[PDB]
Structures are given as C-alpha cells and as structure tokens.
Write a protein that binds this ligand. Sequence first.
Ligand SMILES: C/C=C(\Oc1cccc(C(=O)O)c1O)C(=O)O
Length: 421
Amino acid sequence: SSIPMPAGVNPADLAAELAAVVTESVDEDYLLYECDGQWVLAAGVQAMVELDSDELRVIRDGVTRRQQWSGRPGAALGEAVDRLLLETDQAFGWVAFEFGVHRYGLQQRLAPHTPLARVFSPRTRIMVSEKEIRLFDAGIRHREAIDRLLATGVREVPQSRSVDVSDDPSGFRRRVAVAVDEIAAGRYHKVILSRCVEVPFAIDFPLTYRLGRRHNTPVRSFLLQLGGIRALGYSPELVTAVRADGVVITEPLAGTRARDDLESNSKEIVEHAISVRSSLEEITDIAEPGSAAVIDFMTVRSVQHLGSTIRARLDPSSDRMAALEALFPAVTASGIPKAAGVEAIFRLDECPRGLYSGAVVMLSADGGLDAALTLRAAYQVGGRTWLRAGAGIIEESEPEREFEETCEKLSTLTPYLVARQ
Ligand SMILES: C/C=C(\Oc1cccc(C(=O)O)c1O)C(=O)O
C-alpha cells in the first residue's frame, strides 16, 4: 500500500519519529536504513541470525538453533541469511569490524563469543521518501501509528547537550606514536587507529539521529534498536553495493579538505591511488574475468574528498557475501596493506571494535546487497553510551595533529546529542 507524502514533511524526520513511536508501542526492535532517498524502516523480528566467532545462532518464534561453524564467516552468514530470504523479501543488520579478520588469518585472536554479524528478517517494512510512504505487511497498529503521525506532525527536536572530547583516557596519542614507529620500520604504510569517547548521560537515539541528519550529508545513514544495542550513524562511504543483475560497486574515498589543493596534493593522490589499487585487486578476485574497471577515477566528491568508483560483474562462482568479505574491512578504516593494518589494529586499538568500522547492511531476496561503512556513529550497549572516531596514520603523522583530526570527526555528532526524555 502507498500513502502520498504531505508537503513540508521531511522523510528523515517522519521515518525516525515513526521508528520511535510505533516500535515502542508494539514492543519491537527495528533498523532504519537510508539508501538513495528511501528511508526503510524494518520493524519487528521474524527471524534473527547471530554470527559469533565461535557459534552461529538462528532464532525464530522464541526458539534458538545453535551450531558450530568453520571456514569463511561470509559462507556461514550467507547460508543462514539466504534461508531468511526464502520467506521475506529483505533482511537488515550490522556486520562488525571482526567479520573481516578471518580473511587475514587472525580469527584465532578473537575472544570467545565475539559478535561478527546480526541480520534479521523484519515483520513489517515501511519505506519513507519525499514522494510517498510505502507499507509492506503493516498491520492495524503500524498503520494507525502512521496515520496519527501525519495528523500530529513530528515532535520538535529539543536543545542538545554538550560533551567534552578533549580527554585521552585510552592513550590515543601514545598509540599513534607506536604506529608511526612501526610504519618507519616498514611494517605497513598506513593504519587507522581510533578512540572511544564516553557520553556521560543517556541520549535519545531517534531525536539525536534527526538533529545530526540536518547537519550531515552522508552516503547512507541508519538508526537502530536491535538485541539490546541502540546505534545511529551517518556513513561516509559505501563498502559495497551488489545489484540483482550482478553489477558490483565499491566507492572508496581518500584525501579530504573542508578543491585545487586536494586535486594537486601529492600526499592525497598517493593515498587515493593505493586505495583504488587495493579495491580493484579485491573486486577482481570475485568478479567475472575482464569485468572490473575504475570509473570516474580520483574525482572530487562539511568536507570534500577524492573519490573513485570501482565496478565489476559478480562471477557465477562467487556470491554477495564473498564480495562483502573480499572488500572487508574497508581500507578507509583499516590500513594498507590490509593484512598488516588489520593485525596492527588488534594490538594498537581498543578491541573488539564491534559496529565501529564494520557495516550496516540491507539484503534483498533477488541478490541485492547494500553495505554502508559504519563511521560517524553513536552506540549504546549495557548502560554505556559512546562515540568513536579515528584517523589514518602514515609515516609523517604527528600524535597531536591526529588527536585533533579525531576531534574534527567527532564534531559531526558532538553538537547534536539530545539527552534522554
Ligand atoms: C570516508 C573517509 C574518511 O573519513 C573517515 C576515515 C577514517 C575514520 C573516520 C572516523 O570517523 O572514525 C572517518 O570519518 C577520511 O577521513 O578519509
């Protein structure tokens, strides 16, 4: 069913307000995913797939089926998610940074019960765009919430509450210096290290999402309440998109400014070129021979970046999870060469990273996959609320400038935190 979107109603506001009110009223988890002008609210859990380092669980109708798994995490997750998609048209969820370590032989360094992915089939889907609201399997209470919201309008967003991000309790400056020393010793070229920032008060996730969305222009965005986790984020990069017709895309970004300097700066050009070569090598491993190409190489995309589009056709011997695995973790938030960068993050960052630098995903029964890189995000789990931001460290990096860069990335969220109502 479809309802015309009334004039003067912003889709991000309506979708986040609908997520807040209806799911609390009917007692269900949800994931809201913004993708190319559609805010897709996946509400309620028909079935849940939980992939951990040491176990895979599928939970349906209150019953959990547990199993041991070995080999590639993408194969284990893909087999279970393909079964979900025999019964529903789409599945949604998140994939941890730790999902990408098996490829590099680092699986044995994960602690027991480390989460790798959470993917669910929803009971209801509501898609909100500037044009209309589309309803899929929406029952009486979900339809009544949409009607009430169109009559009452969205809530006014309250004033935000400040947070101090100047302290360094995790020793980010010291950790950057260790990475700089390893890079000078030739261990690797670049690594992204990060720091958590505790938010000392509880936040309202849907209101914070709406407020931050007015001041960010992301490639994708999300807001979720799933299995005891709340999270929201303004993803700056597409990890991968797989279409039903088999076309695979990845759009790495490297080099940033607040245009002539960025396009002529040797440091930005080298970092971009190296990322593009890495993505092309990874995509070529899952692609039909001769189908991989760089389209719009090193073009300029409040920040401006150098960007490239890598496109290929998925090989009939491969699949969307093998494509996600091949491109995971993203270079943008891991390092170069990837294997040494990922290994360095185990030693020099607070692990497990969990959602941070992993992905939020939307899968479709026709073979589609849309995976956004999780950065510029906030999380709440077990009574703890936190932000997390990092910076790419190269041989010339200085700990003080890198700490300042994390402050700049945190500023996408720190002025927009709405305290719990
Ligand atoms: C998408 C590319 C960029 O931004 C990020 C890279 C690494 C870490 C972060 C972060 O926010 O932690 C980030 O926003 C970049 O800074 O090149």
